[PDB]
Short mmCIF file of C-alpha atoms in Angstrom, two decimals:
data_model
loop_
_atom_site.label_atom_id
_atom_site.label_comp_id
_atom_site.label_asym_id
_atom_site.label_seq_id
_atom_site.Cartn_x
_atom_site.Cartn_y
_atom_site.Cartn_z
CA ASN A 59 -152.53 47.23 -1.16
CA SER A 60 -155.02 49.12 -3.24
CA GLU A 61 -155.79 50.85 -0.17
CA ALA A 62 -152.24 51.36 0.00
CA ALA A 63 -152.16 53.23 -3.06
CA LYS A 64 -155.58 54.93 -2.36
CA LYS A 65 -154.06 56.38 1.07
CA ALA A 66 -150.48 57.24 -0.54
CA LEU A 67 -152.22 59.33 -3.43
CA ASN A 68 -154.62 60.89 -0.61
CA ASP A 69 -151.56 61.38 1.40
CA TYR A 70 -149.29 63.79 -0.95
CA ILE A 71 -152.31 65.95 -1.49
CA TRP A 72 -153.30 67.11 1.52
CA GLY A 73 -149.59 67.45 2.35
CA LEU A 74 -149.44 70.40 -0.38
CA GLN A 75 -150.15 73.42 1.57
CA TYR A 76 -151.28 76.74 -0.37
CA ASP A 77 -153.54 79.77 -0.31
CA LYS A 78 -156.38 79.01 -2.65
CA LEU A 79 -157.50 83.04 -2.32
CA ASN A 80 -154.17 83.94 -3.47
CA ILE A 81 -152.73 81.21 -5.90
CA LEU A 82 -155.64 82.19 -8.73
CA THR A 83 -154.80 86.16 -8.75
CA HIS A 84 -153.71 88.25 -11.91
CA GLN A 85 -152.55 91.89 -11.95
CA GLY A 86 -153.25 93.04 -15.63
CA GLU A 87 -151.91 96.57 -15.19
CA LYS A 88 -151.40 99.02 -12.12
CA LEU A 89 -151.56 102.76 -13.22
CA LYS A 90 -150.85 106.22 -11.16
CA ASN A 91 -153.77 107.98 -9.35
CA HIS A 92 -154.85 110.49 -12.11
CA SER A 93 -157.65 112.53 -13.39
CA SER A 94 -158.00 115.42 -15.97
CA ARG A 95 -160.87 117.36 -17.24
CA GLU A 96 -160.61 118.89 -20.75
CA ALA A 97 -163.59 120.89 -22.24
CA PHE A 98 -163.93 121.31 -25.95
CA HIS A 99 -166.10 123.72 -28.35
CA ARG A 100 -167.53 121.90 -30.93
CA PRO A 101 -170.35 122.84 -33.56
CA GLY A 102 -173.44 122.85 -31.49
CA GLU A 103 -171.80 121.98 -28.17
CA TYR A 104 -169.28 122.73 -25.23
CA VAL A 105 -168.18 119.14 -24.70
CA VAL A 106 -166.58 118.40 -21.28
CA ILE A 107 -164.34 115.26 -21.16
CA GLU A 108 -163.21 114.04 -18.00
CA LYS A 109 -160.58 111.24 -17.67
CA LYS A 110 -160.23 109.64 -14.06
CA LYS A 111 -158.34 106.50 -12.66
CA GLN A 112 -160.41 103.49 -11.44
CA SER A 113 -159.36 100.06 -10.43
CA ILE A 114 -161.37 96.62 -10.24
CA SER A 115 -161.44 93.76 -8.32
CA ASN A 116 -163.47 91.19 -10.22
CA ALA A 117 -163.94 87.58 -8.83
CA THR A 118 -165.41 84.98 -10.92
CA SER A 119 -166.05 81.38 -10.45
CA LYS A 120 -167.85 80.38 -13.90
CA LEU A 121 -165.28 80.13 -16.68
CA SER A 122 -165.82 80.59 -20.33
CA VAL A 123 -165.47 78.45 -23.27
CA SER A 124 -163.96 78.91 -27.00
CA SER A 125 -162.51 77.29 -29.61
CA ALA A 126 -158.76 77.35 -28.04
CA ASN A 127 -159.99 75.60 -24.78
CA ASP A 128 -163.06 73.50 -25.91
CA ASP A 129 -161.01 70.46 -26.45
CA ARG A 130 -160.05 70.33 -22.74
CA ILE A 131 -163.05 70.71 -21.11
CA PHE A 132 -165.88 68.28 -19.85
CA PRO A 133 -167.08 67.16 -16.49
CA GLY A 134 -164.34 65.44 -14.80
CA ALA A 135 -161.66 66.86 -16.83
CA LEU A 136 -158.33 67.16 -14.94
CA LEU A 137 -156.44 70.91 -15.33
CA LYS A 138 -153.64 72.70 -14.34
CA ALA A 139 -154.10 75.80 -12.15
CA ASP A 140 -151.56 78.45 -13.27
CA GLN A 141 -150.73 80.97 -15.97
CA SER A 142 -152.22 78.53 -18.45
CA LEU A 143 -155.56 78.49 -16.44
CA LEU A 144 -155.45 82.28 -16.02
CA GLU A 145 -155.28 82.66 -19.78
CA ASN A 146 -158.25 80.72 -19.99
CA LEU A 147 -156.27 78.24 -22.02
CA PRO A 148 -155.30 75.64 -18.87
CA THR A 149 -153.19 72.46 -19.21
CA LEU A 150 -154.99 69.33 -19.32
CA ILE A 151 -152.91 66.25 -17.36
CA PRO A 152 -152.78 62.93 -19.15
CA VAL A 153 -153.07 60.22 -16.39
CA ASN A 154 -155.12 57.12 -15.99
CA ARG A 155 -158.59 58.08 -15.40
CA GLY A 156 -160.70 56.81 -12.97
CA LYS A 157 -164.83 56.57 -13.10
CA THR A 158 -166.37 59.91 -12.51
CA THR A 159 -170.27 60.33 -11.98
CA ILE A 160 -171.91 62.95 -13.85
CA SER A 161 -175.42 64.25 -13.21
CA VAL A 162 -177.50 66.55 -15.90
CA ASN A 163 -180.08 68.53 -14.39
CA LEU A 164 -182.34 68.44 -17.48
CA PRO A 165 -186.33 68.37 -16.29
CA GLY A 166 -188.26 64.83 -15.65
CA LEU A 167 -185.08 62.70 -15.73
CA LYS A 168 -186.02 60.46 -12.59
CA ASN A 169 -184.15 57.24 -11.26
CA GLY A 170 -180.76 56.72 -12.55
CA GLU A 171 -181.47 58.37 -15.87
CA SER A 172 -180.38 61.60 -14.12
CA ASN A 173 -177.01 60.09 -13.44
CA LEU A 174 -174.31 58.65 -15.70
CA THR A 175 -170.55 57.61 -15.04
CA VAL A 176 -167.84 57.35 -17.29
CA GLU A 177 -165.28 54.38 -16.33
CA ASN A 178 -162.59 56.01 -18.42
CA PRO A 179 -163.69 59.66 -18.88
CA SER A 180 -162.20 61.08 -21.98
CA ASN A 181 -163.23 64.08 -23.86
CA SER A 182 -164.62 61.46 -26.70
CA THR A 183 -166.47 59.41 -24.25
CA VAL A 184 -168.04 62.05 -22.31
CA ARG A 185 -169.04 64.28 -24.94
CA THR A 186 -170.64 61.41 -26.59
CA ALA A 187 -172.20 60.09 -23.40
CA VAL A 188 -173.68 63.68 -22.52
CA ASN A 189 -174.43 64.18 -26.01
CA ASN A 190 -176.35 60.79 -26.11
CA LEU A 191 -178.23 61.17 -22.60
CA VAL A 192 -179.18 64.73 -23.97
CA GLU A 193 -180.46 62.66 -27.27
CA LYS A 194 -182.61 60.40 -24.88
CA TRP A 195 -184.14 63.49 -23.48
CA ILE A 196 -184.99 65.27 -26.67
CA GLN A 197 -187.35 62.47 -28.07
CA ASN A 198 -188.79 61.59 -24.71
CA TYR A 199 -189.04 64.30 -22.09
CA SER A 200 -188.56 67.25 -24.77
CA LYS A 201 -191.98 67.04 -25.79
CA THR A 202 -193.64 67.37 -22.49
CA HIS A 203 -190.81 69.11 -20.67
CA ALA A 204 -189.66 72.47 -21.47
CA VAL A 205 -186.92 74.69 -20.27
CA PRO A 206 -186.43 78.22 -21.03
CA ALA A 207 -183.22 79.64 -20.13
CA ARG A 208 -181.13 80.82 -17.02
CA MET A 209 -180.24 84.17 -18.35
CA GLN A 210 -176.92 85.19 -17.08
CA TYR A 211 -176.13 88.80 -18.19
CA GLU A 212 -173.36 90.74 -17.85
CA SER A 213 -172.62 94.25 -19.40
CA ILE A 214 -170.18 97.35 -18.96
CA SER A 215 -168.90 100.46 -20.24
CA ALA A 216 -166.10 99.95 -22.57
CA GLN A 217 -162.96 101.92 -21.28
CA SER A 218 -159.43 99.80 -22.01
CA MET A 219 -158.31 96.80 -23.49
CA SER A 220 -157.06 95.91 -19.90
CA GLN A 221 -160.18 96.16 -17.84
CA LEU A 222 -162.26 94.21 -20.40
CA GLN A 223 -159.80 91.32 -19.42
CA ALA A 224 -160.61 91.74 -15.56
CA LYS A 225 -164.37 91.92 -16.42
CA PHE A 226 -165.05 88.89 -19.04
CA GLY A 227 -161.59 87.13 -18.68
CA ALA A 228 -158.41 87.46 -20.39
CA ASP A 229 -159.74 84.91 -22.80
CA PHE A 230 -161.76 87.61 -24.40
CA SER A 231 -158.43 88.84 -25.86
CA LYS A 232 -158.62 86.18 -28.49
CA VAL A 233 -162.36 86.02 -29.07
CA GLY A 234 -163.27 89.96 -29.39
CA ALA A 235 -160.41 90.42 -32.02
CA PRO A 236 -162.44 90.53 -35.23
CA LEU A 237 -165.37 92.92 -34.29
CA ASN A 238 -163.01 95.68 -34.36
CA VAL A 239 -163.33 97.96 -31.31
CA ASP A 240 -161.67 101.36 -31.55
CA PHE A 241 -160.43 102.55 -27.98
CA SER A 242 -158.98 105.80 -29.53
CA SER A 243 -162.51 106.87 -30.53
CA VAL A 244 -164.34 106.13 -26.97
CA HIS A 245 -161.14 108.02 -25.30
CA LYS A 246 -161.54 110.99 -27.89
CA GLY A 247 -164.89 111.18 -26.59
CA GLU A 248 -166.43 110.71 -30.14
CA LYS A 249 -167.80 107.30 -29.27
CA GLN A 250 -169.55 105.48 -26.69
CA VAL A 251 -168.96 101.78 -26.71
CA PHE A 252 -170.34 99.28 -24.36
CA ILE A 253 -169.76 95.12 -24.33
CA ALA A 254 -172.22 92.66 -22.71
CA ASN A 255 -172.06 89.13 -22.49
CA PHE A 256 -175.12 87.09 -22.60
CA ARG A 257 -175.27 83.37 -21.06
CA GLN A 258 -178.28 81.55 -22.18
CA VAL A 259 -177.67 78.39 -20.02
CA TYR A 260 -180.22 75.48 -20.40
CA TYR A 261 -178.66 72.28 -18.83
CA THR A 262 -175.80 71.61 -16.46
CA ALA A 263 -173.51 68.51 -16.24
CA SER A 264 -172.41 68.68 -12.69
CA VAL A 265 -169.90 65.97 -11.35
CA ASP A 266 -170.29 64.84 -7.52
CA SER A 267 -167.37 64.98 -5.14
CA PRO A 268 -165.59 61.87 -5.36
CA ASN A 269 -165.16 59.93 -1.94
CA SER A 270 -161.60 60.34 -2.42
CA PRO A 271 -158.90 62.09 -4.23
CA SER A 272 -158.02 58.52 -5.30
CA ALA A 273 -161.70 58.09 -6.58
CA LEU A 274 -160.82 60.45 -9.87
CA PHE A 275 -158.15 58.29 -10.94
CA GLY A 276 -157.90 54.35 -12.01
CA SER A 277 -155.42 52.35 -10.33
CA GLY A 278 -151.66 52.18 -11.41
CA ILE A 279 -150.95 55.87 -10.70
CA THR A 280 -148.52 57.11 -7.84
CA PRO A 281 -147.51 60.09 -5.99
CA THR A 282 -144.38 60.25 -8.40
CA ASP A 283 -145.90 60.06 -12.04
CA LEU A 284 -147.66 63.43 -10.87
CA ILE A 285 -144.66 65.52 -9.64
CA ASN A 286 -143.28 63.75 -12.89
CA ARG A 287 -145.55 65.44 -15.10
CA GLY A 288 -145.92 68.57 -13.83
CA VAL A 289 -148.22 68.23 -10.90
CA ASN A 290 -146.94 69.65 -7.62
CA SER A 291 -147.39 72.05 -4.72
CA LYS A 292 -146.27 74.82 -6.98
CA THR A 293 -148.96 74.61 -9.68
CA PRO A 294 -151.51 72.22 -8.12
CA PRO A 295 -154.46 70.54 -10.48
CA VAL A 296 -158.20 71.31 -10.31
CA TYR A 297 -160.80 69.48 -11.96
CA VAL A 298 -164.11 70.37 -13.65
CA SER A 299 -166.87 70.01 -10.88
CA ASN A 300 -169.84 71.49 -13.70
CA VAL A 301 -170.35 72.23 -17.28
CA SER A 302 -172.94 74.71 -18.45
CA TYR A 303 -174.64 74.04 -22.03
CA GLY A 304 -176.23 76.70 -24.02
CA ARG A 305 -175.62 79.65 -26.24
CA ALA A 306 -173.55 82.60 -25.39
CA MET A 307 -172.89 85.80 -27.32
CA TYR A 308 -170.32 88.60 -26.90
CA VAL A 309 -172.32 91.74 -28.47
CA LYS A 310 -170.64 95.33 -28.58
CA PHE A 311 -172.85 98.58 -28.97
CA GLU A 312 -171.21 101.51 -30.52
CA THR A 313 -173.02 104.68 -29.95
CA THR A 314 -172.76 108.10 -30.96
CA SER A 315 -174.90 109.40 -28.13
CA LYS A 316 -172.91 110.76 -25.06
CA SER A 317 -176.08 110.43 -23.00
CA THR A 318 -175.61 109.66 -19.60
CA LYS A 319 -177.71 106.69 -19.16
CA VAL A 320 -176.87 104.40 -22.21
CA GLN A 321 -176.24 101.03 -20.08
CA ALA A 322 -179.53 101.38 -18.59
CA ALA A 323 -180.90 101.67 -22.05
CA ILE A 324 -179.27 98.88 -23.21
CA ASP A 325 -180.08 96.53 -20.01
CA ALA A 326 -183.94 98.08 -20.64
CA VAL A 327 -183.87 96.57 -24.25
CA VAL A 328 -183.55 92.96 -22.53
CA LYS A 329 -185.53 93.61 -19.32
CA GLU A 338 -187.14 107.91 -24.26
CA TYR A 339 -184.25 105.51 -24.71
CA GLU A 340 -185.63 104.70 -28.07
CA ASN A 341 -183.92 107.73 -29.33
CA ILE A 342 -180.57 106.98 -28.44
CA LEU A 343 -181.35 103.38 -29.84
CA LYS A 344 -182.28 104.76 -33.06
CA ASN A 345 -178.65 105.38 -33.91
CA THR A 346 -176.79 102.55 -32.56
CA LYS A 347 -174.42 100.05 -34.31
CA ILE A 348 -174.24 96.46 -32.91
CA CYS A 349 -171.52 94.01 -33.75
CA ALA A 350 -171.70 90.31 -32.47
CA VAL A 351 -170.26 86.82 -32.28
CA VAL A 352 -172.10 83.67 -32.17
CA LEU A 353 -170.79 80.49 -30.38
CA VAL A 363 -173.41 89.20 -38.41
CA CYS A 364 -172.99 92.79 -37.76
CA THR A 365 -175.53 95.24 -38.72
CA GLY A 366 -176.90 98.55 -37.73
CA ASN A 367 -180.22 97.73 -36.42
CA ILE A 368 -181.34 96.46 -33.16
CA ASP A 369 -184.11 94.28 -34.18
CA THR A 370 -181.27 92.11 -35.20
CA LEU A 371 -180.44 91.60 -31.17
CA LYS A 372 -183.94 91.19 -29.97
CA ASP A 373 -184.82 88.39 -32.74
CA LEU A 374 -181.23 86.96 -32.06
CA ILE A 375 -181.74 86.43 -28.19
CA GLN A 376 -185.67 85.91 -28.55
CA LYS A 377 -185.09 83.17 -30.88
CA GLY A 378 -182.54 81.09 -28.57
CA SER A 379 -184.89 81.56 -25.41
CA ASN A 380 -185.75 78.26 -25.32
CA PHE A 381 -183.99 74.95 -26.16
CA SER A 382 -183.62 73.71 -29.79
CA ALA A 383 -185.04 70.09 -30.58
CA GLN A 384 -182.29 69.19 -33.12
CA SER A 385 -179.60 68.46 -31.16
CA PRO A 386 -177.50 69.02 -27.94
CA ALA A 387 -176.04 72.56 -27.33
CA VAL A 388 -172.53 73.78 -27.07
CA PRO A 389 -170.82 74.02 -23.58
CA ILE A 390 -170.58 77.61 -22.69
CA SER A 391 -169.51 77.76 -18.94
CA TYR A 392 -167.56 75.47 -16.57
CA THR A 393 -166.77 75.43 -12.70
CA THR A 394 -163.49 74.12 -11.41
CA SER A 395 -163.03 72.61 -7.78
CA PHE A 396 -160.12 71.88 -5.79
CA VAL A 397 -159.01 68.22 -5.24
CA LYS A 398 -158.00 68.94 -1.84
CA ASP A 399 -160.64 70.53 -0.22
CA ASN A 400 -163.17 70.67 -2.93
CA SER A 401 -163.97 74.15 -2.27
CA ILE A 402 -165.26 76.21 -4.95
CA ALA A 403 -162.35 77.77 -7.20
CA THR A 404 -162.81 81.47 -7.57
CA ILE A 405 -160.37 83.37 -10.01
CA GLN A 406 -159.87 87.06 -8.50
CA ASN A 407 -158.72 89.49 -11.19
CA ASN A 408 -157.47 92.87 -10.41
CA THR A 409 -156.32 95.67 -12.48
CA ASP A 410 -155.89 99.48 -13.21
CA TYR A 411 -157.40 101.38 -15.98
CA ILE A 412 -158.13 104.90 -17.26
CA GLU A 413 -162.06 105.48 -17.06
CA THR A 414 -163.33 108.30 -19.51
CA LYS A 415 -166.51 110.08 -19.21
CA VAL A 416 -168.07 112.22 -21.72
CA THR A 417 -170.63 114.90 -21.28
CA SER A 418 -171.94 116.98 -23.94
CA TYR A 419 -173.82 120.08 -23.24
CA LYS A 420 -175.56 121.36 -26.65
CA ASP A 421 -176.16 125.07 -27.77
CA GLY A 422 -179.29 126.99 -27.58
CA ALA A 423 -180.88 130.18 -28.56
CA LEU A 424 -183.42 132.81 -27.03
CA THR A 425 -185.63 135.07 -29.37
CA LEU A 426 -187.04 138.46 -28.27
CA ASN A 427 -190.20 140.00 -29.58
CA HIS A 428 -191.74 143.33 -28.16
CA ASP A 429 -195.27 144.30 -29.61
CA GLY A 430 -196.56 145.86 -26.54
CA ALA A 431 -197.53 149.55 -27.12
CA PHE A 432 -195.43 150.44 -24.31
CA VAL A 433 -192.00 151.01 -24.59
CA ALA A 434 -189.96 148.26 -22.34
CA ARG A 435 -186.59 147.01 -21.54
CA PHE A 436 -185.05 143.72 -21.12
CA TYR A 437 -182.53 142.21 -18.78
CA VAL A 438 -180.96 138.75 -19.33
CA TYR A 439 -178.20 137.32 -17.43
CA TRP A 440 -176.63 133.84 -17.15
CA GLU A 441 -173.83 131.67 -15.96
CA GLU A 442 -170.45 130.70 -18.02
CA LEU A 443 -168.30 127.76 -18.00
CA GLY A 444 -164.88 128.69 -18.95
CA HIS A 445 -161.21 128.19 -18.84
CA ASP A 446 -158.63 131.20 -18.70
CA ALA A 447 -154.82 132.05 -19.84
CA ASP A 448 -153.06 129.33 -18.05
CA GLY A 449 -155.69 126.84 -18.61
CA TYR A 450 -157.70 126.75 -15.17
CA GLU A 451 -161.12 126.59 -15.33
CA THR A 452 -163.32 129.24 -14.17
CA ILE A 453 -167.07 130.20 -13.67
CA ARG A 454 -168.21 133.70 -14.37
CA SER A 455 -171.29 135.94 -14.51
CA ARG A 456 -172.56 137.05 -17.80
CA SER A 457 -175.02 140.07 -18.51
CA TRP A 458 -176.49 141.08 -21.74
CA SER A 459 -175.45 144.04 -23.74
CA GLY A 460 -178.89 144.96 -25.01
CA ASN A 461 -179.47 145.41 -21.62
CA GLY A 462 -180.97 148.88 -20.25
CA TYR A 463 -181.93 149.76 -23.85
CA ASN A 464 -185.49 151.01 -24.90
CA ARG A 465 -187.33 148.65 -27.45
CA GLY A 466 -189.92 149.51 -29.98
CA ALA A 467 -193.35 148.06 -31.49
CA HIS A 468 -191.43 146.07 -33.77
CA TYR A 469 -188.05 144.71 -32.20
CA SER A 470 -186.19 141.20 -32.94
CA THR A 471 -182.75 140.00 -31.80
CA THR A 472 -181.76 136.70 -31.07
CA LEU A 473 -179.08 135.58 -28.47
CA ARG A 474 -176.86 132.46 -29.45
CA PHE A 475 -175.80 130.41 -26.62
CA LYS A 476 -173.31 127.74 -26.63
CA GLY A 477 -173.08 124.87 -24.29
CA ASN A 478 -170.74 126.44 -21.69
CA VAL A 479 -173.88 129.01 -20.73
CA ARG A 480 -176.10 127.96 -17.51
CA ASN A 481 -178.58 129.32 -15.15
CA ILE A 482 -180.26 131.84 -17.25
CA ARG A 483 -181.74 134.90 -15.24
CA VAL A 484 -184.55 137.42 -16.60
CA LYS A 485 -186.28 140.15 -15.95
CA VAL A 486 -188.63 142.47 -18.21
CA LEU A 487 -189.58 145.91 -17.23
CA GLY A 488 -192.87 147.37 -18.75
CA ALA A 489 -193.02 151.34 -18.91
CA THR A 490 -195.13 153.49 -17.36
CA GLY A 491 -196.28 156.90 -18.54
CA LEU A 492 -195.96 157.92 -14.92
CA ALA A 493 -193.79 159.83 -13.24
CA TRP A 494 -193.26 157.83 -10.52
CA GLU A 495 -192.22 153.71 -10.94
CA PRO A 496 -191.04 154.70 -14.30
CA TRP A 497 -190.77 150.88 -15.15
CA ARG A 498 -193.27 148.25 -14.12
CA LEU A 499 -192.49 144.59 -13.37
CA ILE A 500 -193.47 142.17 -15.86
CA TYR A 501 -191.76 139.08 -15.62
CA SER A 502 -188.61 137.94 -13.62
CA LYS A 503 -187.35 134.24 -13.00
CA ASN A 504 -183.83 132.73 -12.52
CA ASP A 505 -182.15 129.38 -12.90
CA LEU A 506 -183.72 128.99 -16.52
CA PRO A 507 -182.66 125.84 -18.35
CA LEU A 508 -180.68 126.14 -21.94
CA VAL A 509 -183.20 125.11 -24.21
CA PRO A 510 -182.39 124.71 -28.11
CA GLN A 511 -184.73 127.75 -28.46
CA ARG A 512 -186.73 129.71 -25.90
CA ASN A 513 -189.08 132.65 -27.14
CA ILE A 514 -189.64 135.54 -25.05
CA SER A 515 -192.59 137.80 -26.54
CA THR A 516 -194.86 140.70 -24.92
CA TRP A 517 -198.51 141.90 -25.94
CA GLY A 518 -200.88 144.19 -24.14
CA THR A 519 -201.13 147.92 -22.53
CA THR A 520 -199.22 149.66 -20.23
CA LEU A 521 -201.93 148.56 -17.88
CA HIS A 522 -202.75 145.25 -18.86
CA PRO A 523 -199.15 143.93 -20.36
CA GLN A 524 -198.66 140.36 -20.72
CA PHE A 525 -195.63 138.05 -22.17
CA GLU A 526 -194.32 134.54 -23.18
CA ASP A 527 -191.93 132.16 -21.91
CA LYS A 528 -192.15 129.51 -24.75
CA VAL A 529 -190.05 126.25 -24.75
CA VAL A 530 -189.45 125.65 -28.59
CA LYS A 531 -187.00 122.91 -29.06
CA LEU B 2 -154.44 127.16 -2.96
CA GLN B 3 -153.86 130.93 -2.52
CA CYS B 4 -156.56 133.36 -2.86
CA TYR B 5 -157.48 136.97 -2.00
CA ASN B 6 -159.32 136.99 1.11
CA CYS B 7 -160.78 139.64 3.05
CA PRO B 8 -163.04 138.97 5.92
CA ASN B 9 -165.28 141.88 5.64
CA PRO B 10 -165.99 143.28 1.97
CA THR B 11 -163.66 146.28 1.07
CA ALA B 12 -163.46 147.55 -2.14
CA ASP B 13 -159.93 146.66 -2.20
CA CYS B 14 -158.61 143.39 -0.72
CA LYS B 15 -154.98 142.95 -0.73
CA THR B 16 -154.88 140.16 1.74
CA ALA B 17 -154.09 136.70 0.44
CA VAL B 18 -153.79 133.39 2.28
CA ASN B 19 -153.60 129.72 1.41
CA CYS B 20 -156.97 128.36 1.13
CA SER B 21 -157.75 125.04 3.07
CA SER B 22 -158.27 121.51 1.41
CA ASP B 23 -162.16 121.82 1.19
CA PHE B 24 -161.78 124.91 -0.67
CA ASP B 25 -160.96 124.37 -4.38
CA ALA B 26 -161.39 127.99 -6.02
CA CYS B 27 -161.02 131.95 -5.63
CA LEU B 28 -164.12 134.00 -5.90
CA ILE B 29 -164.60 137.85 -6.62
CA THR B 30 -167.85 139.43 -6.07
CA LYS B 31 -168.92 142.94 -7.16
CA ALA B 32 -172.32 143.65 -5.67
CA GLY B 33 -172.97 147.29 -6.37
CA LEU B 34 -170.35 149.14 -4.37
CA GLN B 35 -169.50 146.02 -1.67
CA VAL B 36 -166.42 144.12 -3.35
CA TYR B 37 -166.01 140.17 -1.72
CA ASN B 38 -163.11 138.48 -2.07
CA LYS B 39 -163.05 135.04 -0.62
CA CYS B 40 -161.83 131.50 -0.61
CA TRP B 41 -164.53 129.61 -2.62
CA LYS B 42 -166.12 125.92 -3.60
CA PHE B 43 -166.44 125.56 -7.35
CA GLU B 44 -169.96 123.91 -6.70
CA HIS B 45 -171.23 127.02 -4.91
CA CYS B 46 -169.99 128.99 -7.95
CA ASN B 47 -173.80 129.90 -8.64
CA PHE B 48 -176.25 133.01 -8.28
CA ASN B 49 -178.26 131.26 -5.53
CA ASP B 50 -175.38 129.78 -3.14
CA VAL B 51 -173.62 133.11 -3.93
CA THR B 52 -176.54 135.39 -3.01
CA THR B 53 -177.27 133.05 -0.14
CA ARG B 54 -173.80 133.11 1.18
CA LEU B 55 -173.20 136.95 0.68
CA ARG B 56 -176.49 138.09 1.96
CA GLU B 57 -176.32 140.23 -1.21
CA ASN B 58 -179.14 140.59 -3.47
CA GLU B 59 -177.84 141.36 -7.12
CA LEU B 60 -174.40 141.10 -8.56
CA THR B 61 -171.74 139.92 -10.33
CA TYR B 62 -169.04 137.02 -9.77
CA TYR B 63 -165.99 135.28 -11.08
CA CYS B 64 -164.66 131.78 -9.69
CA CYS B 65 -161.37 130.58 -10.76
CA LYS B 66 -159.06 127.45 -9.99
CA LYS B 67 -155.53 129.12 -9.78
CA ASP B 68 -153.68 131.65 -7.29
CA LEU B 69 -154.64 135.19 -7.16
CA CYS B 70 -156.98 135.45 -10.17
CA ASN B 71 -159.78 136.31 -8.07
CA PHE B 72 -159.03 140.03 -8.08
CA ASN B 73 -161.28 143.29 -8.79
CA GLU B 74 -160.01 144.08 -12.17
CA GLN B 75 -161.69 140.93 -13.36
CA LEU B 76 -165.07 141.72 -13.69
CA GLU B 77 -166.84 144.36 -16.13
CA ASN B 78 -168.94 146.69 -13.54
#
C-alpha cells in the first residue's frame, strides 16, 4: 500500500520520455553571416574597426543566485524545467515534502555532523538548518580549520547584450542593469569594455541521490496531483542536488585603451599592462564604482577567506533530473556581432645633415588606404625630398599617420671622386613607425657616420 | 574578382581575367621599365613578398580590391 504509492509514483516518471540534452536549450538571436572593415582618420591615429559575426554555444551546469530567485533555492528544492528555469526564474512546486539528506563539505566535520536531514524540507527549515550547522562550525572548527575559497573566474570581452546573456545566463539582464553599460561606445570603437564574474565558493550543501523518485516526497501524494499542478512530460521537474555558498560579483571594466591584450591584463591582475590599467574604469555589484583598481584588489583579497561572523549567501546551485539523476546542463546558443578595434598611431621622422659632404636622402614607405568607391588599397610611397642635395644645416621632419607602414631608407654620402659619385652610408627596410625617429649624419667624406634614433 | 593579368611583364597589359578564390586583390607594379599586372593576395602587398615574387630589386606597387583598378596609370613613375 505504501509500497504501492512508491512504485506508482516511480511508475509515471520513468514513463515520461524526453531528450535531456535538448529540453534545456535556448536561442537568443540568430544573425546573418557578415563582416565589415572600416578605417577612420582620427587625431593621432589611423584606426581600423572591423566587425565580424560570431556565434556561441555555452553549456553550463552551475546556475546563479539573485534577489528574484533566492526565495526559490535550497538543497532538495523542486523546480520546473522550462522557460521559467531558462530565465533563471524557475517555478517551484508546492508538494508535500519528504525527508532529504544534505551534506555540507566544511573541513573538520566528522561522524554524522557532516550530514543533515530535513523531514519537511522548506526554505525556512532548510536555510535555518544549514545556517545553524555553519554556526556549529564557526565556534568549533573555524578556529583550527581554515578554508580559502575555490575561485571560479569567468571573464569575457563585451560585444552584445545577447551574448552576455549566453555567457553568464539570461538572469544577468536584471542584475547588471544599474552599472550602466554603453554598447554603442564599444561598437563605435571608443570604449573597450570587459565583463567578469567572480565566484568565491567556500562551502557546498550537497543532497544525496534519493533511493527512489518517491524518496523526494512524503506519503499522500500521487501521479495525478503532479499532472494537475503543471508537472508532466511537457515541462518536467528537476531538483537542486547542490548549492554553493560564498561571495560572487559582477565587475565591469571600461577601458579607453584599444590594445590587443586587455583581457590578459585583467586576468593578470588576479593571477607593461600597468599602463593600460592606469586609466581604466571599474564598476561592480556585490551580492560602489570608482575609477581605481585598488578597489578591486582589496575587494577580492578581502573576501579570499571565510568571515567568522555568520553564514555566507548562496551563490551557485546545481540541478539534477528526478528520472535518471544525471547532471542537468543548460545549453545556450546565440549569434552576435563581434567588434574588433585596432589602432595605428602616428609618427614622425626628423632629418639632420651635419656632414661636410653634400648628401642625398631616400625615404620610402607603404600606405594603407581606400580609394574612390571605398574599397581598400595598399600602395608604395616615395618622399619628395628624394634626389635633392642637402647642406651643412638641413632640417625637415616628415609627418606620418597610422596608415603608414614598412618604411624603407637609404642615405648616400657624396664623394669628390668622379667615379662612384655617391657612396653608401645606411640602408634598411621594414622600419617600424615610431612616434619619433631621428636620422642624423656626421663626419668626413672618408669617415661618414650617421644616426638611427628611437625617440618615442 | 576581375584583374588585368599578363603572365609576362609587358609595358602594357590589356588582358584581364576573373581571379580565383584565393586571390583577394589586384596588383600593378612598376619596376623600372618592366610593368607587372597580376592577380594578387592583399597579405602579399608588401615590399619583401612583392620583390620576392617578381624577381625585381626596386619598384613601386599598388594593390586594390576592386575590378580593373590595377592599371598602369595608377602609379607616379
